[PDB]
Amino acid sequence: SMSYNYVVTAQKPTAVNGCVTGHFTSAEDLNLLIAKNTRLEIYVVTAEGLRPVKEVGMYGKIAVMELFRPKGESKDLLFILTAKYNACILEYKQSGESIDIITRAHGNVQDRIGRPSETGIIGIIDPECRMIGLRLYDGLFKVIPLDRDNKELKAFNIRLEELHVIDVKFLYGCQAPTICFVYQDPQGRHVKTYEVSLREKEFNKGPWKQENVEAEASMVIAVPEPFGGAIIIGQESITYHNGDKYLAIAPPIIKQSTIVCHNRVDPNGSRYLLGDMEGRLFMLLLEKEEQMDGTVTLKDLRVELLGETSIAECLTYLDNGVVFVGSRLGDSQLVKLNVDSNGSYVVAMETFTNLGPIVDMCVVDLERQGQGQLVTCSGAFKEGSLRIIRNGIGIHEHASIDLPGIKGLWPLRSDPNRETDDTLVLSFVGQTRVLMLNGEEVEETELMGFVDDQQTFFCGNVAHQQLIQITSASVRLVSQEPKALVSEWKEPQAKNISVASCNSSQVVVAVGRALYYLQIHPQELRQISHTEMEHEVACLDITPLGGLSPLCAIGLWTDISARILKLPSFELLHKEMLGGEIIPRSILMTTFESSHYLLCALGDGALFYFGLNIETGLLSDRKKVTLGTQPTVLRTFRSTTNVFACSDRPTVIYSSNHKLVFSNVNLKEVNYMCPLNSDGYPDSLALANNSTLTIGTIDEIQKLHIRTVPLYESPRKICYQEVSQCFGVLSSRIEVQDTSGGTTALRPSASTQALSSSVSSSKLFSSSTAPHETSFGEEVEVHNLLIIDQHTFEVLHAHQFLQNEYALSLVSCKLGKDPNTYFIVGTAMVYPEEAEPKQGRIVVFQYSDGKLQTVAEKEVKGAVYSMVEFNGKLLASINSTVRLYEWTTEKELRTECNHYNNIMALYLKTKGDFILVGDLMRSVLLLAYKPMEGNFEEIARDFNPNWMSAVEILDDDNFLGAENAFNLFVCQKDQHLQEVGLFHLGEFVNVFCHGSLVMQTPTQGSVLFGTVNGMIGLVTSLSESWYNLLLDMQNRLNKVIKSVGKIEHSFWRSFHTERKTEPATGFIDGDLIESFLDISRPKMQEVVANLQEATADDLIKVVEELTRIH
């Protein structure tokens, strides 16, 4: 058998890899364009911030993004080069309300042979738009002439003698196209210029040449006219060159960190923004000087500290003091630059969530309610954090009132001429209170004709401009403009009312087993019918689905039956046996997407929903879901109309492509609810708990919600320990040598602000050891194990490891017959500029009474790269060894097995008795534990080389891997492991983890993965028939979907490395499949044309079902 896999995006990439500004959408609009790997986001810069106008996806990793304006254009055009060398020129096209990104030119500029450069792909555009320059490989400069006839973006190569280019730019103010670049040779680093000639397709002698530049010169800045020239930024100095003009400064403020990005503030280059690796923001000023003749020359350079921002990957100045900080290691932000310091000139105004990099993550179900949550280790350095990702629907609360003991909510229009609710009637234990809504103000009032002494079961507006109130004693009908009691119905023998239901013109009241059908008439509650059911009535509903309902839904006590009766004869039309011994609590007739349903919920949290036929009253397609454990009450509201389910976990029911979806509301315990459409709270809801009354609006659809827990240091690994109700997190913080012969922290962080703290007292590497002294300004890493509460996410404890000890692996498990659960950490002694670590530790911690107690330690001769619990034993990877440890009764680790091989097992996963091993460069390996013989054995090995990054076991015979060239692959047994699946994902996978973020199908299994760019994906398995259908749909979709840049989807998903390239196999692009629901219905039929007896509605249900896995 083969392997068929389905990979889909759960969370799009959030890290910013690039940002440019200009007039792309129109000549009058200032735009900000953000590259997030495969996504391009287009914003309009206003005083309110950033207004989104368009977002597109590209079939490629965006490596180059530049705005430029050639002659004959009304706005700027966009040049993009992908990492697979797809080049295109794009234009923003708006036709009224339709937005199209059209391809003005496209082509692939990859060479047949060539070695990619160390500084990566560089793409520059000449200021006169004469040409596009590309540095793709060493020794070659690729030139794309910007001619009107170059529709295919044909290019030619010029031989570059300098084989190691650091950075290159096109110079301003030149009669001929001139490049300026920093290069590296055995003699150091230098800057050189060349004149590019399209006529001769060669280089000409540049205007100048500087033989020597700083050894760490890494960035070139082309200064615009009138000054021109170039600015070279290094680790220590900033220099300006322009023929015979030379300026050089060396400010000590920039020595502490490397400057990694820059941006121009003004079109003449008089001020520049600079950001370093610590998030500091600098201003580079080019000081002018007026001479005696009247000319103005460049006097000096000067930098000035502005303050602190997020660690910036790119910076973009916008309008008046507003700067966008594009970050890949933390959240992006909009910062404000003030001309007067506060000593910081920067002020953060908005933050934008970034999950990247996700270095580790785990799935937990804290409340044990059936839906898991993702807890990731995100960010790095001062941006490091934990993120909690949860599927659900958000609530925006706009009012809160402390009103305990509420037992019922009903909206009401006290005025018959208004179309807006102005009254909220509340029910309590034998009481009924009334509140009025005067705009945004709420005040308790009274309603004439209503009763405050009896608990209300229902009230609202009814026909003939009247009001109704159903209490536990009777049903009262009240006039409107002069409010007064006009009619009242009681039980013939004045017994209490058990169940109540009502619409605009009908009332159905139950008294035990007796039903009474009343009709609302002008000043008259006319009784039409009255019968007796065979069992006691539990719940009622008479919602007119097709305002005179001919049907009446009812739930019974002893039978546990949902019946549809006919008004007024009350005869039975359809009865469904629900089963069990729990009675139904709520029943509701509703309509979803023009289809009619019957909802019925019991007291145990079960929810049955059937298809309802209004003409016959026939129930069909019986299904069941679990919406909690407490009794559930159903109520409709207007978003179409949706159903709110009130229980211990609130759930909103809605529809999507004729399939019901049950989404959890991000709230705790909602006992009663009603819709509320007031002038101060339009299209809102009123929610009541055990203590407060809440008014707010609700989101339309389910999405991923993200909570952020800032750590201000780098998290590394995370594991959940249920028995302690806490997370264990390995973290690292940077410290710099001060002057007291030690290291000092640069800022407070999680490891230095915990409630309690401990330090390692191990003496394993103390005596008979030489010191590793450091120098001034040298940075060191201090590693810690954090204990994080699972509810408040506060740092309960922080244990600091030994100096120069790096925590690499973390696991939470029991071992042997020991009933305690431990945090186990694998470490390594890491010293500067050394090979593989020679010493390490395995430390067993126990969290008890808010403190971490060290239980045992085990010295190891190497780095403990990974650890996993293996059937009551500890499996550890140490350097080039896989070792199995036993937990003795004396609380010590004893070696049982030692598998000495040549692999470097950086990644370990286990299942049953097998182990999947991920090597640094030798792909994956399969080991199996022999129980009777007590050691390991190599079953099979993938023999083609793959620089692994993550590994996962899909099942007993399918093994999933990810490598450093952004590819996925699946290995299978035949011994040799055979690669039966290949797929270019376009992201760097850091962690695989089993689990799901939806409630608990055409697919099997669920594996989540987190990436460097913050993207979260999902992998699942398909059957052969489903894989063949979806593969056929891929080729049909690819013929219809227009691709930005005219990039072939199949070329994009093709497995690609430096030594190997072939199409994808065994993988379905779920993102492409899901886009089938985004095309028009006429365009839908073309896709499914002549598909095998397949209709568009057949695969709408197929694709909609596939969307439910995430």
Short mmCIF file of N, CA, C and O in Angstrom, two decimals, residues 392-426:
data_model
loop_
_atom_site.label_atom_id
_atom_site.label_comp_id
_atom_site.label_asym_id
_atom_site.label_seq_id
_atom_site.Cartn_x
_atom_site.Cartn_y
_atom_site.Cartn_z
N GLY A 392 -12.55 29.10 18.38
CA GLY A 392 -13.82 29.51 18.96
C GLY A 392 -14.33 30.79 18.34
O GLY A 392 -13.79 31.30 17.36
N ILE A 393 -15.40 31.31 18.95
CA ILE A 393 -16.06 32.53 18.50
C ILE A 393 -15.93 33.57 19.60
O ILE A 393 -16.19 33.28 20.78
N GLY A 394 -15.52 34.77 19.22
CA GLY A 394 -15.28 35.83 20.18
C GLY A 394 -16.53 36.62 20.52
O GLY A 394 -17.46 36.73 19.73
N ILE A 395 -16.54 37.16 21.74
CA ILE A 395 -17.63 37.99 22.24
C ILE A 395 -17.05 39.35 22.61
O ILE A 395 -16.02 39.42 23.30
N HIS A 396 -17.69 40.41 22.15
CA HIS A 396 -17.25 41.78 22.41
C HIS A 396 -18.24 42.40 23.39
O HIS A 396 -19.30 42.89 22.99
N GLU A 397 -17.89 42.38 24.67
CA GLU A 397 -18.79 42.86 25.71
C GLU A 397 -18.75 44.38 25.78
O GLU A 397 -17.68 44.98 25.89
N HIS A 398 -19.93 45.00 25.70
CA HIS A 398 -20.04 46.45 25.74
C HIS A 398 -20.77 46.97 26.97
O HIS A 398 -20.84 48.19 27.16
N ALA A 399 -21.32 46.08 27.80
CA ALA A 399 -22.01 46.51 29.00
C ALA A 399 -22.06 45.34 29.97
O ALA A 399 -22.18 44.18 29.56
N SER A 400 -21.98 45.66 31.26
CA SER A 400 -22.01 44.64 32.31
C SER A 400 -22.79 45.19 33.49
O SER A 400 -22.57 46.33 33.90
N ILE A 401 -23.70 44.38 34.02
CA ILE A 401 -24.54 44.76 35.16
C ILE A 401 -24.53 43.61 36.16
O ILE A 401 -24.82 42.47 35.79
N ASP A 402 -24.21 43.92 37.41
CA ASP A 402 -24.18 42.91 38.47
C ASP A 402 -25.61 42.64 38.92
O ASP A 402 -26.17 43.38 39.73
N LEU A 403 -26.20 41.57 38.39
CA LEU A 403 -27.58 41.18 38.71
C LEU A 403 -27.62 39.68 38.93
O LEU A 403 -27.84 38.90 37.99
N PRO A 404 -27.43 39.23 40.17
CA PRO A 404 -27.36 37.79 40.44
C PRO A 404 -28.74 37.14 40.45
O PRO A 404 -29.77 37.80 40.57
N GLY A 405 -28.72 35.81 40.32
CA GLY A 405 -29.94 35.03 40.43
C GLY A 405 -30.90 35.16 39.26
O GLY A 405 -32.10 34.97 39.44
N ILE A 406 -30.39 35.47 38.08
CA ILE A 406 -31.25 35.64 36.91
C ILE A 406 -31.69 34.28 36.40
O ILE A 406 -30.89 33.33 36.34
N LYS A 407 -32.97 34.16 36.04
CA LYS A 407 -33.53 32.90 35.57
C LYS A 407 -34.19 32.99 34.20
O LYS A 407 -34.82 32.02 33.77
N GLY A 408 -34.06 34.12 33.50
CA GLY A 408 -34.67 34.26 32.19
C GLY A 408 -34.55 35.64 31.58
O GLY A 408 -34.60 36.65 32.29
N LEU A 409 -34.38 35.70 30.26
CA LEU A 409 -34.20 36.95 29.52
C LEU A 409 -35.15 36.99 28.33
O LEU A 409 -35.34 35.98 27.64
N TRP A 410 -35.73 38.16 28.08
CA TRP A 410 -36.63 38.35 26.95
C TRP A 410 -36.54 39.79 26.45
O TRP A 410 -36.73 40.71 27.25
N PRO A 411 -36.26 40.00 25.17
CA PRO A 411 -36.31 41.35 24.61
C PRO A 411 -37.75 41.79 24.36
O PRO A 411 -38.66 40.98 24.19
N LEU A 412 -37.94 43.11 24.34
CA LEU A 412 -39.29 43.65 24.26
C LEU A 412 -39.25 45.08 23.72
O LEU A 412 -38.36 45.86 24.07
N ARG A 413 -40.24 45.41 22.89
CA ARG A 413 -40.41 46.75 22.34
C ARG A 413 -41.63 47.37 23.01
O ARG A 413 -42.77 47.09 22.64
N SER A 414 -41.38 48.22 24.02
CA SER A 414 -42.46 48.86 24.75
C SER A 414 -43.27 49.83 23.89
O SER A 414 -44.34 50.27 24.32
N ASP A 415 -42.78 50.17 22.70
CA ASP A 415 -43.45 51.09 21.79
C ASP A 415 -43.71 50.33 20.50
O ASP A 415 -42.76 49.80 19.90
N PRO A 416 -44.97 50.23 20.03
CA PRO A 416 -45.24 49.45 18.82
C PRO A 416 -44.82 50.12 17.52
O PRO A 416 -44.79 49.44 16.48
N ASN A 417 -44.51 51.42 17.53
CA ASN A 417 -44.11 52.09 16.30
C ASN A 417 -42.62 51.99 16.00
O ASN A 417 -42.22 52.19 14.85
N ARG A 418 -41.79 51.70 17.00
CA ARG A 418 -40.36 51.56 16.77
C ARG A 418 -40.03 50.12 16.36
O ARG A 418 -40.72 49.17 16.74
N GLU A 419 -38.97 49.98 15.57
CA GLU A 419 -38.47 48.67 15.16
C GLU A 419 -37.25 48.25 15.96
O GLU A 419 -36.49 47.39 15.51
N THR A 420 -37.06 48.82 17.15
CA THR A 420 -35.87 48.62 17.95
C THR A 420 -36.26 48.28 19.38
O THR A 420 -37.12 48.94 19.96
N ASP A 421 -35.63 47.24 19.94
CA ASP A 421 -35.88 46.86 21.32
C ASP A 421 -35.45 47.98 22.27
O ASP A 421 -34.39 48.58 22.10
N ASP A 422 -36.29 48.25 23.26
CA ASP A 422 -35.97 49.23 24.29
C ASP A 422 -36.21 48.69 25.70
O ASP A 422 -36.13 49.46 26.66
N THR A 423 -36.48 47.40 25.83
CA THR A 423 -36.86 46.81 27.11
C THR A 423 -36.25 45.42 27.23
O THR A 423 -36.18 44.68 26.25
N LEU A 424 -35.81 45.08 28.44
CA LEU A 424 -35.26 43.76 28.74
C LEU A 424 -35.92 43.25 30.01
O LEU A 424 -35.69 43.80 31.09
N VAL A 425 -36.75 42.22 29.88
CA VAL A 425 -37.48 41.66 31.01
C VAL A 425 -36.69 40.48 31.57
O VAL A 425 -36.27 39.59 30.83
N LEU A 426 -36.50 40.48 32.89
CA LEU A 426 -35.68 39.49 33.57
C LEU A 426 -36.53 38.70 34.56
O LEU A 426 -37.40 39.26 35.23
#
